[PDB]
């Protein structure tokens, strides 16, 4: 095969630079197909959902009802693993902030998302969340959830 | 950081189904010196065939690249971040590929010359006029085969 240093290498700028999916540590790694990020997010109290949002199709409420039934009411944080998906939540003052993500998504990014959502939900709705009825916050908040889902799934 | 937070296996009666996602997660350790990641044939800003080997915003970037390339014949490599973009423009048709920053450029241009030869013998003068993605269904697989070959 022939010779090429007569051909220069030019530095250029890009508005949207190239992002190859890989791993969050090392950079000799590539995924041969797409990684997806946060698929679904829900705020709940115990077994009662208050707001939600999904990015695409999925039996998210079916699964969410099964999850919430398992989570203890005492404060804590945790990740559940099933098939190719992970479920991350924070329970605080009995309110659960949960999301569902590709197995290939960085957990730390997931919990940052959850902390952010919590901060906004708590500043927006305060004590109301302790008593509010099913889906009470959904019409207003789902769109907050959708914007954060987008934000944290890119950057 | 979240290493302290455990990861627990659970079981479900009715498990999660999300249609429209890829069948699996395949990660490779990257042959930085033998890894052509993407290849595209275009006329000016109009793409005619393409093929990607791995995940990436290749069409996003490709639109930004083609915008920069002058129409007169020439060959060149562009550098951005950890990647290089190598092209041959000939009779306005652009043959471009994307690779790591440490890849052997001579291998890239060999690939590009090969692809050009085939595209030109297969499609001849059509390339001057053919509509967007017109050659893609049939040629992407030629691109994929050569991509595989020149990466090994
Ligand atoms: Pr996956
Ligand atoms: Pr490198």
Residue numbers in the entry:
A (entry chain A): 19 to 173
B (entry chain B): 21 to 172
Question: How does the study describe this entry?
Answer:
VAMP7 (also termed Ti-VAMP) (Advani et al., 1998; Galli et al., 1998) is one of the largest R-SNAREs, having a 120 residue N-terminal longin domain (Pryor et al., 2008; Rossi et al., 2004). It is involved in the fusion of lysosomes, late endosomes, and compartments derived from them with a number of target membranes including the plasma membrane and endosomes (for a comprehensive review of VAMP7 function see (Chaineau et al., 2009)). AP3 (subunits δ, β3, μ3, σ3) is one of the family of heterotetrameric clathrin adaptors that in mammalian cells has been localized mainly to tubulovesicular, early-sorting/recycling endosomes with a minor location at the trans-Golgi network (TGN) (Peden et al., 2004; Simpson et al., 1996; Theos et al., 2005). We show that the linker of the δ-adaptin subunit of AP3 binds the VAMP7 longin domain and determines the structure of their complex.
Crystals of this construct showed anisotropic diffraction to 2.8 Å in the best direction. The structure of the complex was readily solved by molecular replacement using as the search model the longin domain only of VAMP7 extracted from the Hrb/VAMP7 longin domain structure (Pryor et al., 2008). The two copies in the asymmetric unit, which represent the VAMP7 longin domain/δ-adaptin complex (i.e., excluding the connection arising from the fusion protein) are very similar in structure despite their different crystal environments, showing that the structure is not perturbed in the fusion protein construct. Surprisingly, since there is no detectable sequence homology between the relevant portions of Hrb and δ-adaptin, the fragment of δ-adaptin binds to the longin domain following approximately the same route as that taken by Hrb (Pryor et al., 2008) and by VAMP7's own SNARE motif (as inferred from biochemical [Pryor et al., 2008] and NMR shift mapping [Vivona et al., 2010]). This δ-adaptin/Hrb binding site is a hydrophobic trough that runs half way round the VAMP7 longin domain. The interaction buries a total of around 1,990 Å2 of solvent accessible surface area (determined with PISA; Krissinel and Henrick, 2007) and is mediated by mainly hydrophobic residues, which is typical of the low μM KD interactions seen in the protein:protein interactions involved in transport vesicle formation. The corresponding interface on the VAMP7 longin domain includes Leu4, Phe25, Val28, Ile32, Lys42, Leu43, Tyr45, Tyr50, and Phe52.
